[PDB]
Write a protein that binds this ligand. Structure first.
Ligand SMILES: Nc1ncnc2c1ncn2[C@@H]1O[C@H](CO)[C@@H](O)[C@H]1O
Ligand SMILES: Nc1ncnc2c1ncn2[C@@H]1O[C@H](CO)[C@@H](O)[C@H]1O
Ligand code: NA
Ligand code: NA
Lengths: 115, 115
């Protein structure tokens, strides 16, 4: 129910653990299981929004909260030289789990194009 | 003054044109001059925030507004198969212009890692 039906719903309900680095009442941040950089974590809302194309206007503050949490977590993890934030939408975006998630990657030079 | 001192301040003040695809009172979206995908645009706040690490808690709604605008613009441009949103912070993130900007890329499969 709360948290939705995906892998990430299970993480939000704590049925399966994750390496949690931030939790407040709106969201959770945890290390990614398949890291693509020395630091690679996800920030997810506790509210189930399936994808960024399904977010509503009233979700603006929550979406922005995910980036503010990502900034805080990045600083707690020592990302003094910067980082990249990524949200994937749909097939072309590379989205594999239909629960919004913000990637935060750093600890190395990020290249261009971003995939 | 309003819009700040960077390339993007000049775009916001309209001193130099850009190919604008959305403007409301909070932000502007325009095509990127160096596109990395068939569709590649930027969404920027009109308020000068230098980088995502400098955004404040009260900027949450504005940051989320950038992603909602990006979703709308992507749909207006036909990105039915999805897209990737990217914010770069600092040197490791690949940030070159110190005014927050959200990249939206689509019209091709986006790869992984995201740089
Ligand atoms: N159980 C899990 N814990 C942490 N990250 C996960 C888990 N399952 C999938 N992921 C990550 O979720 C992301 C979905 O975009 C991927 O980068 C993937 O590695
Ligand atoms: N005058 C401009 N109009 C549109 N995009 C620009 C301009 N100058 C730089 N850019 C884009 O700004 C981005 C900064 O991250 C780059 O992808 C770059 O190509
Ligand atoms: Na912090
Ligand atoms: Na639209």
């Amino acid at each position: 129910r709360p948290g939705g039906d995906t892998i990430f719903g299970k993480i939000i309900r704590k049925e399966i653990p994750a390496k949690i680095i931030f939790e407040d009442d709106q969201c959770l941040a945890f290390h990614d299981i398949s890291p693509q950089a020395p630091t690679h974590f996800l920030v997810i809302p506790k509210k189930h929004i399936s994808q960024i194309s399904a977010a509503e206007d009233a979700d603006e503050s929550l979406l922005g909260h995910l980036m503010i949490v990502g900034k805080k977590a990045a600083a707690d993890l020592g990302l003094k030289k910067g980082y990249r934030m990524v949200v994937n939408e749909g097939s072309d975006g590379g989205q594999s789990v239909y629960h919004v998630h913000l990637h935060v990657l750093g600890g190395r030079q990020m290249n261009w194009p971003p995939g």
